[PDB]
Paper text:
Androgen binding to AR leads to activation of genes involved in the development and maintenance of the male reproductive system and other tissues such as bone and muscle. AR is distinguished from other nuclear receptors in that after hormone binding, it preferentially responds to a specialized set of coactivators bearing aromatic-rich motifs, while responding poorly to coactivators bearing the leucine-rich “NR box” motifs favored by other nuclear receptors. Structures of AR in complex with FxxLF, LxxLL, FxxLW, WxxLF, WxxVW, FxxFF, and FxxYF motifs reveal a changing surface of the AR coactivator binding interface that permits accommodation of both AR-specific aromatic-rich motifs and canonical leucine-rich motifs.
Surprisingly, the binding mode of FxxFF to AR resembled that of the tryptophan peptides more closely than the binding mode of FxxLF. Like the tryptophan peptides, interactions with Glu897 are mediated by Ser−2 instead of the peptide backbone.
Numbering used by the authors:
A (entry chain B): 99 to 106
B (entry chain A): 669 to 918
The structure:
C-alpha cells in the first residue's frame, strides 16, 4: 500500500 | 559539550500542517470529522518521515519500523496537538491545525466532546508542569516506542535497546540544570506519569475512530486511503488486546 511504499 | 541528541530531535521536528478545512462553512459532524481524517492522513506522512530520521530508528527490522508507527500514530499526534494547543492558544482550545481549531461548539458537534476534554486537559498539563520544549521533544520520541504486540516484535531486542536509550536521554535532559537527586527523581516521576496519561486518551480515540470507520458511509464521513487501512487492520489488534501500551506505572 501507499504506507508500505514508504519503507518499500 | 554538544547536545547531539537534542540537536537532532529539534532539527527533524515536522513543520506546520494544515487540514484544508473550509471554515467558511457551518460546522457539521461530517465536515469536521472528514477534516480531522484528512489531517490525520497528512500528519501521518510527516510522522513517517520524522520517525525514519530518529537516531537509531533504522536499527529496527523494517517490519517493526512500520509496526511501531502504525500502533503509535494516535498518541504521537495527540501529544503534539496538546503541545500546539498549549503554546498557541494556551490550551483554551484544541489547535489541531491552523485551519482546524476546536472551540466548545466544535468539540460538541464532533460528537467526541468527552475525548476532547481529556485532550484539553493533557494540553493544560503542559502548562501546569511547565514542560520545556526540549522535554516535549524527547517525550514525543519516546511515545513512538510505547506500544507493542504482546507476542513481541520481529526483532524485540533491537526495540528494547532503542526504547532504553530514549529513556536514558529523557533522564539526562532532566539532569541538565538540576543538580539535586530528589529533584531529578521528582521530574522523571511527573513526566512518566504524563506519558502514561496519553495512552488512555489514545485508546478512546482508537475505539471512536474504529466505530466511525465501520459506519462512515452512513454518516457521510470520509476516511483517506492510509487511515482506512490502518484503522481496520492495525487498530483492531489494539482494541482486542493483541497490542498494548507500555506503562511506566501500572
Ligand atoms: C489524529 C488526529 C489528527 C492530527 C491531530 O492533530 C490529532 C487528532 C486526534 C483525533 C483524531 C485525528 C485524526 C482523525 C480521527 C482518528 C477521527 O477519525 C476520530 C479521532 C481523530
Amino acid at each position: 500500500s501507499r504506507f508500505a511504499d514508504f519503507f518499500r | 559539550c554538544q547536545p547531539i541528541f537534542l540537536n537532532v530531535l529539534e532539527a527533524i521536528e515536522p513543520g506546520v500542517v494544515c487540514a484544508g478545512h473550509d471554515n467558511n462553512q457551518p460546522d457539521s459532524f461530517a465536515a469536521l470529522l472528514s477534516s480531522l481524517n484528512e489531517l490525520g492522513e497528512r500528519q501521518l506522512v510527516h510522522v513517517v518521515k520524522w520517525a525514519k530520521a530518529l537516531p537509531g530508528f533504522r536499527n529496527l527490522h523494517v517490519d517493526d519500523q512500520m509496526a511501531v508507527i502504525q500502533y503509535s500514530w494516535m498518541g504521537l499526534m495527540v501529544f503534539a496537538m496538546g503541545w500546539r494547543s498549549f503554546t498557541n492558544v494556551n490550551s483554551r482550545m484544541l489547535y489541531f491545525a491552523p485551519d482546524l481549531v476546536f472551540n466548545e461548539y466544535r468539540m460538541h458537534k464532533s460528537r467526541m466532546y468527552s475525548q476532547c476534554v481529556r485532550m484539553r486537559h493533557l494540553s493544560q498539563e503542559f502548562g501546569w508542569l511547565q514542560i520545556t520544549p526540549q522535554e516535549f521533544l524527547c517525550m514525543k520520541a519516546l511515545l513512538l516506542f510505547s506500544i507493542i504486540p504482546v507476542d513481541g516484535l520481529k526483532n524485540q531486542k533491537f526495540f528494547d535497546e532503542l526504547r532504553m536509550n530514549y529513556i536514558k536521554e529523557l533522564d539526562r535532559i532532566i539532569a541538565c540544570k538540576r543538580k539535586n537527586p530528589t529533584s531529578c527523581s521528582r521530574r522523571f516521576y511527573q513526566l512518566t506519569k504524563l506519558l502514561d496519561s496519553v495512552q488512555p486518551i489514545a485508546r478512546e480515540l482508537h475505539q471512536f475512530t474504529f466505530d466511525l470507520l465501520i459506519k462512515s458511509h452512513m454518516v457521510s464521513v470520509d476516511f483517506p486511503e492510509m487511515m482506512a487501512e490502518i484503522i481496520s487492520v492495525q487498530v483492531p489488534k489494539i482494541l482486542s488486546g493483541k497490542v498494548k501500551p507500555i506503562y511506566f506505572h501500572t
